[PDB]
Design a binder for this molecule. Structure first.
Ligand code: NAI
Ligand code: NAI
Lengths: 255, 255
């Protein structure tokens, strides 16, 4: 009744898995039209078949390429007639210390996490300015607020996301375009589980237990728990919020 | 459908006016049982008559007195059978510079804004520990993050609220008691209109226009826009959030 997301068009980058996919489900569940922009064509089409929903559309998109970003925005406008909410959720992680990291690896992290956010936002904003309203939601991280160990390029990129979020909030408030971010803690997603095994010793379950011990709530976050923050930020419930960060980390940054 | 506040018992301090009252309305609208603890008996009873709702109960309460805080918690348990959410919303403002401020005035601000929050939380937590779950929501302020001019005691008190919020989050996460705060910007309430006239030159409407201009969104917040943040923090939607602050200030702290 109060979410009021019915007939709103929501473009979600990295929507084919993890937090992005949980966001797809949550928004479809609120009667929003959802457009997923993701680089993984196979996983994207699989998603379309599983969800089997009129309100869902997939468009293959590499956000590091500007033409593809524009095309993703145009796909939303063609398919559902507009674009109310952009969720810049795609991101990658590469583990490497600064003193050993390859420039090409640094750039791969920054290009997806930050440059792609810029490019998607650029073209979404062109449309939202013309339409007279809009909403942008960025997937930041605890890593944008404090440093996760051993992932400096990631942390840096998310620091960029935090300030880009605030910048766009301040520059576009006069045009009624709200811009906020969510800062997730450690979320239990398949992709993350791969990172757990690569960078810690022990079985998957043992590593999960260790990670779920670093949070005051004593558990890892679920993708849907971040998706729910995105619902709030997209809805009119958060109408006086712009340029802000919502932390969802089980108490991690509180200590 | 997803808020899931039906049959949850919510105790709101300062609930008889402004943000507190808007919170009463929002929570009643979500089928929560609401208990208002407020010092103003007349205004409290007036509220009860206007709302005319079985789910609303008023209990006169001076939160600076510990016995009254305990009694407010007990009133919730007796009336509705439990206590799921405490919203520490009551607060006052006194305008005075540090070099001129009377100790008695300093203490009046701290006692309501901070001590009362402690006392209400103390007794709510005793019950929530026994019940095995709970939620505390504190009304902080932009003043807890940066300094509003000319209200140092208020700012100090809200700095206390921010850290008390984080402290309780960290200490009670293991018992599944989530603790968060909302940091409102400038909200258009009747009592804030009195403050506008007392501390600025011009008509009410002229002063409102000036205050609206200092936010990137170019308007004052509405009480219900803060109440809506409280709904989110009370609901299961925010289940992975604890020890966090949600800023709702029209972009004020983003610049
Ligand atoms: N612990 C956690 O899980 C946290 C995650 N986040 C952020 O959440 C976001 C998503 O998280 P997860 O669900 O774990 O990620 P994920 O790895 O599960 O999924 C990300 C999606 O982004 C896509 N993607 C990658 N590069 C792309 C490109 N150039 N163009 C388009 N799509 C691309 C992938 O295909 C994938 O579907 C990321 O920004 C991540 O950094 C933030 C803090 C914590
Ligand atoms: N309006 C604004 O711009 C901002 C407001 N806030 C905070 O929001 C909260 C509510 O704000 P408003 O709704 O404007 O306040 P308000 O003045 O409209 O209402 C506060 C309520 O608390 C009650 N109260 C006062 N002393 C009390 C005591 N000892 N015991 C019990 N109740 C008592 C009052 O009687 C009243 O019903 C406060 O904590 C305030 O500091 C924070 C930042 C900005």
């Amino acid at each position: 009744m109060i979410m009021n997301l019915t007939d709103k068009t929501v473009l979600i980058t990295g929507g084919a898995s993890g937090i992005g996919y949980a966001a797809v489900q949550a928004f479809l569940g609120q009667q929003a039209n959802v457009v997923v922009a993701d680089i993984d064509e196979a996983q994207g089409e699989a998603m379309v078949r599983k969800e089997n929903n009129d309100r869902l559309h997939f468009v293959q998109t590499d956000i590091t390429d500007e033409a593809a970003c524009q095309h993703a925005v145009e796909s939303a406008v063609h398919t559902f007639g507009g674009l109310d909410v952009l969720i810049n959720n795609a991101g990658i992680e590469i583990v490497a210390p600064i003193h050993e990291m390859e420039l090409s690896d640094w750039n791969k992290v920054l290009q997806v996490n930050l440059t792609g956010m810029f490019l998607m936002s650029k073209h979404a904003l062109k449309h939202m300015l013309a339409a007279g309203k809009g909403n942008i939601i960025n997937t930041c991280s605890v890593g944008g607020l404090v440093a996760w160990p051993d992932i400096p390029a990631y942390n840096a990129s998310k620091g960029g996301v935090l300030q880009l979020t605030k910048s766009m909030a301040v520059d576009y408030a006069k045009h009624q375009i709200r811009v906020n971010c969510v800062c997730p803690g450690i979320i239990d997603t398949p992709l993350n589980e791969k990172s757990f095994l690569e960078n810690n010793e022990g079985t998957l379950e043992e590593i999960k237990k260790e990670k779920a011990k670093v949070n005051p709530l004593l558990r890892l976050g679920k993708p849907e728990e971040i998706a729910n923050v995105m619902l709030f930020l997209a809805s009119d419930l958060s109408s006086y919020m712009t340029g802000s960060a919502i932390t969802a980390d089980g108490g991690y940054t509180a200590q």
